[PDB]
Enzyme design. Structure first.
Site, mmCIF file in Angstrom:
data_model
loop_
_atom_site.group_PDB
_atom_site.id
_atom_site.type_symbol
_atom_site.label_atom_id
_atom_site.label_comp_id
_atom_site.label_asym_id
_atom_site.label_seq_id
_atom_site.Cartn_x
_atom_site.Cartn_y
_atom_site.Cartn_z
ATOM 1 N N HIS A 99 -29.918 -16.007 -34.211
ATOM 2 C CA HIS A 99 -29.112 -17.237 -33.727
ATOM 3 C C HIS A 99 -29.108 -17.286 -32.292
ATOM 4 O O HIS A 99 -29.236 -16.145 -31.317
ATOM 5 C CB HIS A 99 -27.797 -17.357 -34.193
ATOM 6 C CG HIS A 99 -26.642 -16.582 -33.779
ATOM 7 N ND1 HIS A 99 -26.037 -16.902 -32.437
ATOM 8 C CD2 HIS A 99 -25.965 -15.438 -34.183
ATOM 9 C CE1 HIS A 99 -25.395 -15.880 -32.057
ATOM 10 N NE2 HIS A 99 -25.229 -14.963 -33.171
ATOM 11 N N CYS A 100 -28.770 -18.515 -31.713
ATOM 12 C CA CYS A 100 -28.593 -18.604 -30.169
ATOM 13 C C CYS A 100 -27.280 -19.319 -30.067
ATOM 14 O O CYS A 100 -26.373 -19.218 -30.813
ATOM 15 C CB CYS A 100 -29.844 -18.884 -29.281
ATOM 16 S SG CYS A 100 -30.451 -20.527 -30.026
ATOM 17 N N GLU A 101 -27.157 -20.406 -28.932
ATOM 18 C CA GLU A 101 -26.111 -21.159 -28.712
ATOM 19 C C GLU A 101 -26.038 -22.276 -29.927
ATOM 20 O O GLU A 101 -25.073 -22.503 -30.524
ATOM 21 C CB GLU A 101 -26.058 -21.636 -27.363
ATOM 22 C CG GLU A 101 -24.739 -22.455 -27.103
ATOM 23 C CD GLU A 101 -24.392 -22.999 -25.766
ATOM 24 O OE1 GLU A 101 -25.465 -22.929 -24.920
ATOM 25 O OE2 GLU A 101 -23.610 -23.589 -25.421
ATOM 26 N N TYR A 139 -24.082 -20.259 -32.367
ATOM 27 C CA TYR A 139 -22.456 -19.651 -32.122
ATOM 28 C C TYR A 139 -21.688 -20.949 -31.962
ATOM 29 O O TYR A 139 -20.341 -21.126 -32.213
ATOM 30 C CB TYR A 139 -22.624 -18.932 -30.974
ATOM 31 C CG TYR A 139 -21.040 -18.276 -30.820
ATOM 32 C CD1 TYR A 139 -20.707 -17.024 -31.730
ATOM 33 C CD2 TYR A 139 -20.499 -18.749 -30.011
ATOM 34 C CE1 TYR A 139 -19.485 -16.465 -31.459
ATOM 35 C CE2 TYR A 139 -18.909 -18.271 -29.784
ATOM 36 C CZ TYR A 139 -18.710 -17.014 -30.742
ATOM 37 O OH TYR A 139 -17.398 -16.427 -30.519
#
Ligand SMILES: [Cl-]
Length: 177
Positions: A99-101, A139
Site C-alpha cells: 500500500h501507499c498513501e 493509508y
C-alpha cells in the site's frame, strides 16, 4: 472460488477482494486488512507482511501496526528476496499486502516489481510470494476506518506542507524518475 489461482497456481486466493484501478491486480478492503491483523485466518496464514511503500516521513507520521517501510525497490527486494520469508508449515501461507498513501501509484508499482523479481529468480511457475494484494485506498482510507490499528494514531500526507524538502531528498535516492 470464482477467481483464478494465485501466482504459482497452487490454490485459490484466500481473501475477498474489491474492485481497484488496476483490473488485473487483487485489492482488499480495510476490513479485510483488519481480519488479517486480528488473526481471523490464523489457522491458514502463517505470515503476512504489510509493505508500506510511502516515503519515510509519511510512515513516521502514522502507519499500520506491524507494517515495514520499504519505499525503494532495492530495499523491498533485499528485505523480501535476499532470504525469503516462508511459512513454518507447508500447510500454511505467506501473503504480502502492498500500500501507499492512496494505493494508486506507488503501491501497485512495487507489487509488480516484486512479482517480476520473484519470477526472475525462480523456475516458472514457482514463487516465494504467489499471493500479493494491494490495500484499496491506502493509508488515507485505512486510518479513518481503524485508527487504533495505526501507530502513531495520525496521518501525514505525501504533499504535507512542512515536508517539501524531505520529499525531494527522498526522490533523489530512487533508481529512476
Ligand atoms: Cl527505487
Amino acid at each position: 472460488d470464482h477467481r483464478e489461482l494465485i501466482g504459482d497456481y497452487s490454490k485459490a486466493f484466500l481473501l475477498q477482494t474489491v474492485d481497484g484501478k488496476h483490473q488485473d491486480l487483487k485489492y482488499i478492503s480495510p476490513e479485510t486488512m483488519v481480519a488479517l491483523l486480528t488473526g481471523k485466518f490464523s489457522n491458514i496464514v502463517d505470515k503476512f507482511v504489510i509493505v508500506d511503500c510511502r516515503y519515510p516521513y509519511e510512515y513516521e507520521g502514522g502507519h499500520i501496526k506491524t507494517a515495514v517501510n520499504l519505499p525503494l525497490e532495492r530495499d523491498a527486494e533485499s528485505f523480501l528476496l535476499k532470504s525469503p520469508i516462508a511459512p513454518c508449515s507447508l500447510d500454511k501461507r505467506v501473503i504480502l499486502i502492498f500500500h501507499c498513501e492512496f494505493s494508486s501509484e506507488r503501491g501497485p508499482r512495487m507489487c509488480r516489481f516484486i512479482r517480476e523479481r520473484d519470477r526472475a529468480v525462480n523456475d516458472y511457475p514457482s514463487l516465494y510470494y504467489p499471493e500479493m494484494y494491494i490495500l484499496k485506498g491506502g493509508y488515507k482510507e485505512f486510518f479513518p476506518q481503524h485508527p487504533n490499528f495505526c501507530e502513531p494514531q495520525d496521518y501525514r500526507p505525501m504533499n504535507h506542507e512542512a515536508f517539501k524538502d524531505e520529499l525531494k531528498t527522498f526522490r533523489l535516492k530512487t533508481r529512476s524518475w
